Design an enzyme around this catalytic site. Structure first.
Site, mmCIF file in Angstrom:
data_model
loop_
_atom_site.group_PDB
_atom_site.id
_atom_site.type_symbol
_atom_site.label_atom_id
_atom_site.label_comp_id
_atom_site.label_asym_id
_atom_site.label_seq_id
_atom_site.Cartn_x
_atom_site.Cartn_y
_atom_site.Cartn_z
ATOM 1 N N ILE A 151 51.848 36.360 23.121
ATOM 2 C CA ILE A 151 52.868 37.351 23.455
ATOM 3 C C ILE A 151 52.487 38.108 24.734
ATOM 4 O O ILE A 151 51.300 38.209 25.049
ATOM 5 C CB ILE A 151 53.147 38.311 22.280
ATOM 6 C CG1 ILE A 151 51.901 39.030 21.757
ATOM 7 C CG2 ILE A 151 53.869 37.583 21.155
ATOM 8 C CD1 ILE A 151 52.197 40.203 20.871
ATOM 9 N N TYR A 155 57.838 39.863 19.990
ATOM 10 C CA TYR A 155 58.684 38.777 19.486
ATOM 11 C C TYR A 155 60.178 39.089 19.597
ATOM 12 O O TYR A 155 61.007 38.273 19.195
ATOM 13 C CB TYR A 155 58.368 38.453 18.019
ATOM 14 C CG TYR A 155 56.995 37.872 17.852
ATOM 15 C CD1 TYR A 155 56.745 36.519 18.038
ATOM 16 C CD2 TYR A 155 55.931 38.694 17.568
ATOM 17 C CE1 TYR A 155 55.460 36.001 17.904
ATOM 18 C CE2 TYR A 155 54.648 38.198 17.442
ATOM 19 C CZ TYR A 155 54.404 36.850 17.604
ATOM 20 O OH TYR A 155 53.081 36.454 17.526
ATOM 21 N N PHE A 189 49.531 42.544 7.406
ATOM 22 C CA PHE A 189 48.212 42.669 8.018
ATOM 23 C C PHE A 189 47.574 41.275 8.143
ATOM 24 O O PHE A 189 47.668 40.483 7.206
ATOM 25 C CB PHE A 189 47.362 43.622 7.164
ATOM 26 C CG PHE A 189 45.973 43.883 7.689
ATOM 27 C CD1 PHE A 189 44.946 42.972 7.471
ATOM 28 C CD2 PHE A 189 45.698 45.032 8.420
ATOM 29 C CE1 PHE A 189 43.663 43.226 7.924
ATOM 30 C CE2 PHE A 189 44.421 45.264 8.920
ATOM 31 C CZ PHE A 189 43.406 44.355 8.673
ATOM 32 N N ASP A 190 46.894 41.007 9.268
ATOM 33 C CA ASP A 190 46.239 39.740 9.538
ATOM 34 C C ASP A 190 44.938 40.017 10.277
ATOM 35 O O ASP A 190 44.930 40.821 11.196
ATOM 36 C CB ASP A 190 47.141 38.851 10.401
ATOM 37 C CG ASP A 190 46.531 37.536 10.881
ATOM 38 O OD1 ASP A 190 46.069 36.767 10.033
ATOM 39 O OD2 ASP A 190 46.553 37.281 12.109
ATOM 40 N N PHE A 195 47.600 46.243 17.189
ATOM 41 C CA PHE A 195 46.410 45.410 17.098
ATOM 42 C C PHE A 195 45.173 46.222 17.437
ATOM 43 O O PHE A 195 45.237 47.062 18.323
ATOM 44 C CB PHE A 195 46.432 44.238 18.083
ATOM 45 C CG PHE A 195 47.472 43.181 17.805
ATOM 46 C CD1 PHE A 195 48.767 43.329 18.248
ATOM 47 C CD2 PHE A 195 47.143 42.050 17.075
ATOM 48 C CE1 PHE A 195 49.720 42.356 17.970
ATOM 49 C CE2 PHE A 195 48.089 41.071 16.825
ATOM 50 C CZ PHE A 195 49.370 41.221 17.280
ATOM 51 N N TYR A 197 40.545 39.971 16.190
ATOM 52 C CA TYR A 197 41.574 40.986 16.086
ATOM 53 C C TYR A 197 41.926 41.251 14.621
ATOM 54 O O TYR A 197 41.730 40.435 13.731
ATOM 55 C CB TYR A 197 42.848 40.621 16.863
ATOM 56 C CG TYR A 197 43.639 39.504 16.237
ATOM 57 C CD1 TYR A 197 43.255 38.193 16.436
ATOM 58 C CD2 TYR A 197 44.660 39.761 15.336
ATOM 59 C CE1 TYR A 197 43.941 37.148 15.845
ATOM 60 C CE2 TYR A 197 45.329 38.728 14.706
ATOM 61 C CZ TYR A 197 44.971 37.411 14.964
ATOM 62 O OH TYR A 197 45.604 36.336 14.375
#
Ligand SMILES: COc1ccc(CC[C@@H](OC(=O)[C@@H]2CCCCN2C(=O)[C@@H](c2cccs2)C2CCCCC2)c2cccc(OCC(=O)O)c2)cc1OC
Length: 128
Positions: A75, A101, A55-56, A118, A45
């Site tokens: 989640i 969250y 951003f990740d 995502f 992802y």
């Protein structure tokens, strides 16, 4: 950009039909099969706040993200969203705080009341 496009054209995949989780298929996967509750799922992802920050990418840990589907290990939106995906599919998800969250966030990175975006690729899934 990609978040706005999900707003505009994404399919509402929530039970309550509250637009809490919206989905576009970006690359069509294989077959008809989607994962069962309890299946070990392997994904790559890229995620961010909908406004672009934080951003990740799983790619940066050079290893897939792995969890058991539908067990509350991620989640709510991910339990809901990954359940609709075929092997090889890439999807975009836009997610309201209620399915992420909420008011507590996941500090410090994720603030209270955050909408998330995502891009998710379902690599594979397997029963334990
Ligand atoms: C609010 O509800 C929940 C919140 C958190 C969880 C756990 C958070 C959970 O994160 C997630 O559900 C989602 C989907 C999977 C990828 C990570 N993730 C994120 O939001 C990440 C995001 C990136 C970009 C925007 S958000 C987020 C990155 C910052 C740390 C929290 C995770 C998580 C599960 C397993 C491991 C993990 O981090 C590595 C580690 O701990 O070794 C983090 C389950 C929950 O619901 C039942």
């Amino acid at each position: 950009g990609a978040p706005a496009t999900v707003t505009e054209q994404g399919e509402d995949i929530t039970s309550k039909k509250d637009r809490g989780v919206l989905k576009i298929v970006k690359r069509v996967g294989n077959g008809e099969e989607t994962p069962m509750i309890g299946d070990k799922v392997y994904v790559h992802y890229k995620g961010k706040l909908s406004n672009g920050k934080k951003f990740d990418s799983s790619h940066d840990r050079n290893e897939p993200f792995v969890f058991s589907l539908g067990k509350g290990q991620v989640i709510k939106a991910w339990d809901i969203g990954v359940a609709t995906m075929k092997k090889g599919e890439i999807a975009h998800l836009l997610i309201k705080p209620e399915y992420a969250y909420g008011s507590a966030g996941s500090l410090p990175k994720i603030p209270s009341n955050a909408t998330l975006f995502f891009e998710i690729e379902l690599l594979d899934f397997k029963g334990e």
